[PDB]
Amino acid sequence: DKLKEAETRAEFAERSVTKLEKSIDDLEDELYAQKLKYKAISEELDHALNDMTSI
């Protein structure tokens, strides 16, 4: 029928959506983890300089 040639696509986009959603969820999470690590490193450098601030 004409149904299947589109239903084939209808189901097809389901796995597409699932892959995209899980991938983007992982991407944002790891990106935020990296941003937090970079913020930690920058704060470490600056506040280590300022905890020194000569002795």
Binding site: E44, L45, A48, I55
Partner: protein, 57 residues
């Protein structure tokens, strides 16, 4: 980082130790030199008293 901070702490601890030893040595040296100059004055006074006793003799 972290280990750099440890190195910074260590490089100041020995500085404090050296400064403390320097202060102690300065105090000891000054006291010893003051005692030595006092003994110099004592020797001069003893020479003067010897001279006066020789005059009386």
């Amino acid at each position: 980082m972290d280990a750099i901070k440890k190195k910074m702490q260590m490089l100041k601890l020995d500085k404090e130790n050296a400064l403390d030893r320097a202060e102690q040595a300065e105090a000891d040296k000054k006291a010893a030199e003051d005692r030595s100059k006092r003994l110099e004055d004592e020797l001069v006074s003893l020479q003067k008293k010897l001279k006066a006793t020789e005059d009386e003799l």
